[PDB]
Amino acid sequence: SSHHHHHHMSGENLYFQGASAAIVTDTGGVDDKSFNQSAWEGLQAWGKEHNLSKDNGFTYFQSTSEADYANNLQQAAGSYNLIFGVGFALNNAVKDAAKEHTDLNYVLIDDVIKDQKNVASVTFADNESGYLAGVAAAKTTKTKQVGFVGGIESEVISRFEAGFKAGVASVDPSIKVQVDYAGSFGDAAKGKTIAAAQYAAGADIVYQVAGGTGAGVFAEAKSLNESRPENEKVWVIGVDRDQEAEGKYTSKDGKESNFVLVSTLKQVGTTVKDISNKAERGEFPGGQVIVYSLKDKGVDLAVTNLSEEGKKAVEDAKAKILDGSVKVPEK
Numbered sequence: 093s094s095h096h097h098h099h100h101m102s103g104e105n106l107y108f109q110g111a112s113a114a115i116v117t118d119t120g121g122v123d124d125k126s127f128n129q130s131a132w133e134g135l136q137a138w139g140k141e142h143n144l145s146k147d148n149g150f151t152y153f154q155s156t157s158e159a160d161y162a163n164n165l166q167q168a169a170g171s172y173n174l175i176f177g178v179g180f181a182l183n184n185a186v187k188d189a190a191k192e193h194t195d196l197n198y199v200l201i202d203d204v205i206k207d208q209k210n211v212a213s214v215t216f217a218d219n220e221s222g223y224l225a226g227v228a229a230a231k232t233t234k235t236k237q238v239g240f241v242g243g244i245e246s247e248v249i250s251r252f253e254a255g256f257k258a259g260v261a262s263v264d265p266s267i268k269v270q271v272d273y274a275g276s277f278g279d280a281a282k283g284k285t286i287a288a289a290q291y292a293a294g295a296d297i298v299y300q301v302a303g304g305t306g307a308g309v310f311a312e313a314k315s316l317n318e319s320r321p322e323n324e325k326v327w328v329i330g331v332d333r334d335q336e337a338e339g340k341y342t343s344k345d346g347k348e349s350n351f352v353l354v355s356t357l358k359q360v361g362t363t364v365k366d367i368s369n370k371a372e373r374g375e376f377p378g379g380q381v382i383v384y385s386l387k388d389k390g391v392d393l394a395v396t397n398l399s400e401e402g403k404k405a406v407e408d409a410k411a412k413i414l415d416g417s418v419k420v421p422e423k
């Protein structure tokens with residue numbers, strides 16, 4: 093109302109104290125074209141906004157196995173006071189690191205840690221984006237058979253799968269969805285052999301929800317499409333980032349096309365940047381669970397090469413998810 097007892101602080105004497113933010117990466121690595129890459133692009137963009145550079149305010153520690161998680165988190169505790177665990181698999185290692193370093197702030201992406209004041213948890217309604225990918229897939233299949241390549245069987249990938257199946261069923265319940273899991277988010281060779289088998293069995297669209305394993309699914313679709321006419325091409329649905337640029341190829345009949353139908357978006361980078369800004373301002377949301385869904389555009393579908401009929405069905409499906417008229421299952 094009033095502030096009679098006040099003192100003027102000159103701008104020459106004022107500063108904002110900065111934070112140092114690091115990501116600890118899951119198996120996919122910062123070149124997975126999807127989940128970990130999104131996180132890394134977000135941290136780089138945060139670093140740029142704060143006039144920082146790699147290993148001078150921000151960096152990444154790549155994990156190659158589960159045993160690496162703890163070592164990477166402990167290494168990050170040396171110079172960083174905001175540390176991101178990028179992947180549900182990092183749950184336990186983040187819990188342990190947050191308990192040993194109560195003075196530092198920790199974020200878990202894709203799962204929830206309870207009753208830890210220095211931990212924030214971020215989840216995405218990947219069922220809702222998956223549903224839209226399913227509607228898109230059902231509106232473009234000619235063979236009436238589509239493929240789903242998961243990374244690791246889990247609550248997280250089951251949301252994608254359950255949403256995708258439900259979305260396909262909402263358009264045409266007669267469509268067959270072949271489901272196979274690679275058992276890794278960093279095994280490209282397994283992605284290629286699963287995609288090869290799913291296409292050979294009559295899938296004309298594969299949705300790859302497997303991080304870096306998905307590079308094999310792109311490689312398989314490129315090989316098939318290179319040795320075929322453009323009108324006989326087979327589709328891939330992108331994940332986490334808009335992957336349209338990865339679907340470019342030249343057909344057998346010399347035509348240049350794109351085999352990316354649509355991409356589910358998961359704004360991991362945007363979350364990294366937004367929470368890093370909250371941490372620097374001393375407003376770190378410790379103990380909170382942050383839920384991103386279709387409503388807040390934390391997940392979305394990039395429509396890319398979908399037919400106008402498909403786009404209308406997507407917009408109708410999206411509107412019904414926001415309305416509450418359609419409840420997308422999580423299992």
Ligand SMILES: O=c1ccn([C@@H]2O[C@H](CO)[C@@H](O)[C@H]2O)c(=O)[nH]1
Pocket residue numbers: 117118119120121124126127128178179180181202243248277278300301302303304331332358
């Ligand atoms: O290293 C990785 C890569 C991907 N994912 C999961 O796989 C999904 C699809 O890439 C991502 O949204 C994320 O939930 C992981 O858990 N770890």
Ligand SMILES: C[As](C)(=O)[O-]
Pocket residue numbers: 261262263264
């Ligand atoms: C009326 As319907 C469930 O086929 O979109």
Ligand code: NI
Pocket residue numbers: 093094095
């Ligand atoms: Ni006032």
Ligand code: NI
Pocket residue numbers: 097098099
């Ligand atoms: Ni005074």
